[PDB]
Amino acid sequence: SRLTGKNALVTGSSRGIGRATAVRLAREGALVAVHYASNEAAADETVAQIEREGGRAFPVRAELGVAGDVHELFLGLEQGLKERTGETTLDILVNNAAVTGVDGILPEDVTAEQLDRYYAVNAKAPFLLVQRAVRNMPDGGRIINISSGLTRCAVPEQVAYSMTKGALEQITLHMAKHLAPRGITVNSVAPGITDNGGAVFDIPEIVEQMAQSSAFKRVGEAGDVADVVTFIATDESRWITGAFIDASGGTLL
Amino acid sequence: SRLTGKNALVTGSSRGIGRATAVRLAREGALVAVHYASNEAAADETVAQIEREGGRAFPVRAELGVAGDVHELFLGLEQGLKERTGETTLDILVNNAAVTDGILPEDVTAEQLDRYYAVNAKAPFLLVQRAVRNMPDGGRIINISSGLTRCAVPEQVAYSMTKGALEQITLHMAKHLAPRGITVNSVAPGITDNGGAVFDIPEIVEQMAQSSAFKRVGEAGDVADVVTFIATDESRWITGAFIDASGGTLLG
Ligand SMILES: NC(=O)C1=CN([C@@H]2O[C@H](COP(=O)(O)OP(=O)(O)OC[C@H]3O[C@@H](n4cnc5c(N)ncnc54)[C@H](OP(=O)(O)O)[C@@H]3O)[C@@H](O)[C@H]2O)C=CC1
Numbered sequence: 133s134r135l136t137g138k139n140a141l142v143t144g145s146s147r148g149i150g151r152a153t154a155v156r157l158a159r160e161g162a163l164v165a166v167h168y169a170s171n172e173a174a175a176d177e178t179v180a181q182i183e184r185e186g187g188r189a190f191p192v193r194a195e196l197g198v199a200g201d202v203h204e205l206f207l208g209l210e211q212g213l214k215e216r217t218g219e220t221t222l223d224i225l226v227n228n229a230a231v232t233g234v235d236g237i238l239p240e241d242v243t244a245e246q247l248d249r250y251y252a253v254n255a256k257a258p259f260l261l262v263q264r265a266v267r268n269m270p271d272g273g274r275i276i277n278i279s280s281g282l283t284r285c286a287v288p289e290q291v292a293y294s295m296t297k298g299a300l301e302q303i304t305l306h307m308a309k310h311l312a313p314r315g316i317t318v319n320s321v322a323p324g325i326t327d328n329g330g331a332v333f334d335i336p337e338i339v340e341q342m343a344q345s346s347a348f349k350r351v352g353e354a355g356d357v358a359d360v361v362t363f364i365a366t367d368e369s370r371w372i373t374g375a376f377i378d379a380s381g382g383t384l385l
Numbered sequence: 386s387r388l389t390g391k392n393a394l395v396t397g398s399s400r401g402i403g404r405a406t407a408v409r410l411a412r413e414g415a416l417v418a419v420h421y422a423s424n425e426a427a428a429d430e431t432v433a434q435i436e437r438e439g440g441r442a443f444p445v446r447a448e449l450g451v452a453g454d455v456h457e458l459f460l461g462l463e464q465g466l467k468e469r470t471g472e473t474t475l476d477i478l479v480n481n482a483a484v485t486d487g488i489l490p491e492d493v494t495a496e497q498l499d500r501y502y503a504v505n506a507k508a509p510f511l512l513v514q515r516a517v518r519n520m521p522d523g524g525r526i527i528n529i530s531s532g533l534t535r536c537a538v539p540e541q542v543a544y545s546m547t548k549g550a551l552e553q554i555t556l557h558m559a560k561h562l563a564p565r566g567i568t569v570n571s572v573a574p575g576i577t578d579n580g581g582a583v584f585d586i587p588e589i590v591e592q593m594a595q596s597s598a599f600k601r602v603g604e605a606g607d608v609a610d611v612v613t614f615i616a617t618d619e620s621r622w623i624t625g626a627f628i629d630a631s632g633g634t635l636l637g
Pocket residue numbers: 143144145146147148149150167168169170171172174194195196197227228229230231232253278279280281322323324325326327328
């Protein structure tokens with residue numbers, strides 16, 4: 133129970149790594165805001181798991197990458213926090229939500245609209261969420277940006293996505309220095325291929341190809357990544373800031 | 386109690402980061418071999434702290450960087466593990482011991498280059514090579530590096546060469562040992578209070594503190610807490626990595 137009395141926001145925690153992260157932060161005692169865009173049933177399933185495991189959570193709906201996104205997220209976040217604690221304190225922000233697609237887009241096919249959508253959700257929104265979140269964050273808080281090993285591993289069909297993770301990691305570098313005087317750490321956690329419950333992970337043949345990317349010759353589980361995020365959210369990571377934390381199962385060898 | 390039933394060796398755990406590491410691994414339930422070169426009294430103090438906190442440890446003497454060093458260390462390690470467990474299983478190796486105001490490049494001698502590398506690079510490699518004989522699937526190898534591998538400091542060139550070599554053990558042995566589920570990682574401190582007399586001088590401590598983004602020197606426990614997490618099951622998806630435990634020293 134390393135996060136008793138702490139409040140956390142995990143963006144995009146209806147599903148996948150974000151769900152696994154929300155679940156683990158709540159097991160440590162955090163009150164978790166389970167954010168999503170449209171899959172309300174999946175968000176409610178994250179919250180239901182947390183409640184059945186004895187923790188506390190609530191859903192927050194906000195489409196990122198559109199005007200008023202940060203506002204809408206913080207309206208729901210602060211209402212839920214205040215109703216449950218009397219305060220709006222935000223100890224932990226995990227920038228996990230993303231436009232993230234198995235399909236990819238080869239470079240010849242990328243559209244300007246796709247560049248904008250990826251940017252808006254995966255780079256711009258995290259930046260503006262950090263800027264808003266720090267207002268509510270006490271000295272000693274945690275900002276965790278979920279990147280990708282593809283910032284270090286060339287994959288043409290993910291160029292547009294990867295640009296935005298490269299921008300995200302700059303948030304980590306420069307905001308770690310900016311926020312160090314407040315004792316707020318800022319770190320990147322970089323997954324490799326991770327089973328998020330998508331259909332592709334039900335096709336054993338493709339799963340076996342994907343598994344070869346890891347030195348362990350298996351795809352990651354959501355909990356493999358979420359366990360690392362959870363550690364970073366704790367007090368014992370205090371001397372880690374501005375870092376790139378490889379949570380890829382040895383993909384970046 | 387994340388390390389119940391596990392056996393750990395922390396090299397150079399009589400003092401400094403290694404002592405803080407041994408203490409924290411033992412709090413999690415590991416049986417800790419507290420290794421040292423010559424300061425038996427300091428080793429016995431680490432062991433006494435672990436026992437008073439309700440854990441298990443024993444001391445092991447071996448000078449590294451001399452003929453017969455790995456053999457001497459493993460003779461003591463395996464005797465102590467067998468007496469206490471009936472087994473010689475080694476779950477966790479932390480390569481922490483090192484030769485560590487530097488030496489200006491012009492003044493570095495061949496003999497100094499040899500001593501730094503014997504202790505700080507060669508011995509860690511040979512200790513990994515021997516340790517895996519004893520290590521179950523799912524084990525942990527943790528190499529203590531330095532942020533100086535990423536931050537130029539001329540008077541640390543000789544030291545830093547050996548940490549650069551140590552980090553290659555991380556990279557290539559992580560790939561080698563991955564089929565066994567053994568992870569291999571580097572943890573890189575910044576300036577860290579190891580109880581040396583320079584940390585008793587508030588004026589020098591204040592100058593050293595400016596290297597961290599937090600404007601304090603590291604405590605041994607700041608680093609040891611990271612090492613301890615890497616030793617646990619929850620780090621299983623981290624291998625071959627450079628883990629910055631420097632308090633933001635590489636931000637500049
Ligand atoms: N192999 C992998 O799974 C890898 C994942 N990552 C990264 O890990 C993170 C999590 O990935 P993963 O679990 O696979 O993601 P999923 O695609 O499984 O889930 C995405 C989550 O983000 C939310 N989301 C998506 N778009 C928006 C938006 N515009 N506004 C608000 N919320 C949105 C979703 O909400 P809703 O449910 O409402 O749609 C959902 O909660 C991402 O940053 C991803 O880039 C990195 C490397 C590999």
